[PDB]
């Protein structure tokens, strides 16, 4: 049978006087899939490493997203 | 059967007086797939490393996205 | 069966008086796929390394995207 | 079956009075695919390295995209 | 079956009074494909290195895209 995965749907109709704002949001930041269909059978593998190492150190980031914002 | 994966759909209809703003957002920042169909069977592999090493150091970033913004 | 993956769809109809702004956003920043079809079977591989090394150092970035903005 | 991958679709109809702005955005920043069809079987490989090394150093970037902007 | 990959489609119809602006954006910054069809089987390989090394040094970039802009 058919599959929908991780799909984002948006619809807007007759919308008026609308603001949308977005600072530093994330969707689906890390996504990993294995999928076999109809198969007659050592296995698929996914890895994902995000190491941060910081020593004597400041304000480091390891990330999918990073936003730094200053407003006066 | 059919598959939809990670698809982003947007529709706008009759929209008026609309602002959209976006600072430093992310979608689907890392996406990994393995897929086999109809297959008669050492396995496919995906790796993803984002190492940050920072030593005696400042304001480093390792990322899919990085935004730095200052407004006065 | 048919597949849709990571497709971005947008539709706008009768739209009026519209602003769209986008600073430092990202979509699908890293995307990795393996796919076998109808196959009678050492395995496909994808790698992706983004290392940052910083020592005694400042404001470094290793990234798919990097945006720096100053406004007065 | 047929496949759509990483395709970006946009349609605009009867649109009026529209601004679109975009600073430093990215789509599909790194994309890697392996694909085999109808095959009777050492494996295809993709690698991608973005190393940044910075020592005693400032404001370095290793990136797919880099935008620096100043406005007064 | 047929394939669409990384295709960018745009359509504009009856559009009026339109600005589109774009500073330092990127699409499909790095794209890597391997593909075999109908094949009876040492494997194709893609590499992509973007090293930046900076020592005692300033404002270096190694990138697919780099935009620097100043406005007064």
Residue numbers in the entry:
A (entry chain A), B (entry chain C), C (entry chain E), D (entry chain G), E (entry chain I): 26 to 66, 70 to 100
Report text from the authors:
Here we go beyond the mesoscopic polymorphisms of amyloids from human lysozyme and HEWL, providing unprecedented evidence at the atomic level for the different folding motifs in the irreversible and reversible amyloids derived from a single protein sequence, by combining atomic force microscopy (AFM), cryo-electron microscopy (cryo-EM) and solid-state NMR. By combining atomic force microscopy, cryo-electron microscopy and solid-state NMR, we show that a full unfolding of the native protein precursor is a requirement for establishing irreversible amyloid fibrils. In contrast, under the longer heat-treatment in the presence of a reducing agent, native lysozyme undergoes a complete unfolding, which allows it to fold into irreversible fibrils, with twelve and ten in-register inter-molecular β-sheets for human lysozyme and HEWL, respectively.
